[PDB]
Amino acid sequence: SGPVPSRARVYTDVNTHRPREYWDYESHVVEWGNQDDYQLVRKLGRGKYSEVFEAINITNNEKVVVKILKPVKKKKIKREIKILENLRGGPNIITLADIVKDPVSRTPALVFEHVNNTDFKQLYQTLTDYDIRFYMYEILKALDYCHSMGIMHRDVKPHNVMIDHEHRKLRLIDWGLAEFYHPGQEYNVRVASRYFKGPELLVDYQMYDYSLDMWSLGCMLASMIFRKEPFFHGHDNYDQLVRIAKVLGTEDLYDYIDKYNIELDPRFNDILGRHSRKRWERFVHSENQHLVSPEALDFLDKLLRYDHQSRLTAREAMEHPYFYTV
Numbered sequence: 001s002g003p004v005p006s007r008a009r010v011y012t013d014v015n016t017h018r019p020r021e022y023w024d025y026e027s028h029v030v031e032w033g034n035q036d037d038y039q040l041v042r043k044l045g046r047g048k049y050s051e052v053f054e055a056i057n058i059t060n061n062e063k064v065v066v067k068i069l070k071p072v073k074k075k076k077i078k079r080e081i082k083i084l085e086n087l088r089g090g091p092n093i094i095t096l097a098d099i100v101k102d103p104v105s106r107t108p109a110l111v112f113e114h115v116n117n118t119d120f121k122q123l124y125q126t127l128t129d130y131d132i133r134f135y136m137y138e139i140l141k142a143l144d145y146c147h148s149m150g151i152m153h154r155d156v157k158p159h160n161v162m163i164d165h166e167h168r169k170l171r172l173i174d175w176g177l178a179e180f181y182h183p184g185q186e187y188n189v190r191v192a193s194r195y196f197k198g199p200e201l202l203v204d205y206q207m208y209d210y211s212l213d214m215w216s217l218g219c220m221l222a223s224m225i226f227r228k229e230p231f232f233h234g235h236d237n238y239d240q241l242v243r244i245a246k247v248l249g250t251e252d253l254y255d256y257i258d259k260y261n262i263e264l265d266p267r268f269n270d271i272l273g274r275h276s277r278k279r280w281e282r283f284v285h286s287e288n289q290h291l292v293s294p295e296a297l298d299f300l301d302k303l304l305r306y307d308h309q310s311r312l313t314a315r316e317a318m319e320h321p322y323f324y325t326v
C-alpha cells in the first residue's frame, strides 16, 4: 500500500536544525541592483531558462559572466538565488557576484565569477588518469560541501562542470535545478539531464536525496575512464532505464522496486526485457585502458547502484583508494 519511505544516510536533518530563513526561499527577499554597472561584451551561449554573456564590471574593470533569465517561474528564480547566496564562497561552487536587472527590460539577471572554460570535448582527449582523479576529487569537494549545506544539485553533468585546465580550477555551475533536502519530502522527478537521471527519477520514486548527485557523478566518471560520452545513452526517459538495465541487469532493478514497493509504469512492460548483470571490465578497450584501474572500477561500482541508499556518500567517496594519489 504505497511506496516505502526513505531518508538520506548523511546530513539528514541539517535543514531541520536551521531557522526557516535558510531554506524558505519563497520568503527570501531578492534585491535586484542596477545592470548599468555591467557592459555586455559577447554571447557565450543560449539555453533552456537562460542566455549567458561575457561582461565587464564598469566599477572595477573585471570580467564577469551575466546569465539573463527567462522569467518563467518566480519561485524557481528565488530558489536558485537563495541556494547561490547560501553556498557563496564554498569550495568549487560558482560565485554569484551580483543580482541585477537592466533598467528598461527589468529582466532578471545573475552575475557570476568569470571562469575561462575548456570545452569538455577538447579536454576529453588530453585528460590523464591523474587529471580524472584530481577533477573528480574537486567535484567531490563541491558536493560534500553543498550536501552538508542541505542542498542537492540535481543537475550534475559535464556542461555544469566548468574547468580552467591551465589553472587547474573547477566550478560546479547552474544551481537552477537545486533543492533543499528535507527528510521525508516528496520531490519532482522531472530533474537532471536524461543521461545522468537516477533510477529513482526514472521509476518515479519521489522521496530521493543527495544520493541522486552521486548517481550523476558515477555517469560522469564512467564516461571519462571509458571514453564513452554519454555512458548510458537513452533516447527518452523510459529508454534511459533500459540502458541502465542493459549494464546493471534486470534482477537488481526488480530488487530495488521491491525494497521500496514502487509501482513500475506500464510503458516499461514492452521495452525493459531481461538483462544479465555486466562486469565493469567489459568496458575496457585499447583506447581507454590507460585511464582504467582496479581502484577506478571498485569506486565506479560503488556509485552506479539502483538503490540510492547503497551508493557512497560524497564523504565516503573522498576516502576511496582511487583518490590516494591526490
Ligand SMILES: O=C(O)c1ccc(Nc2nc(-c3ccc4ccccc4c3)cs2)cc1O
Binding pocket: 044, 045, 046, 047, 052, 065, 067, 094, 112, 115, 116, 117, 162, 173, 174, 175
Ligand atoms: O548558471 C550558472 O551558474 C553559470 C555560471 C557560470 C557560467 N559561466 C560560463 N558559461 C560559459 C558558457 C559557454 C558556452 C555555452 C554554450 C551554451 C550555453 C551556455 C554556455 C555558457 C562560459 S563561462 C555559466 C552559467 O550558466
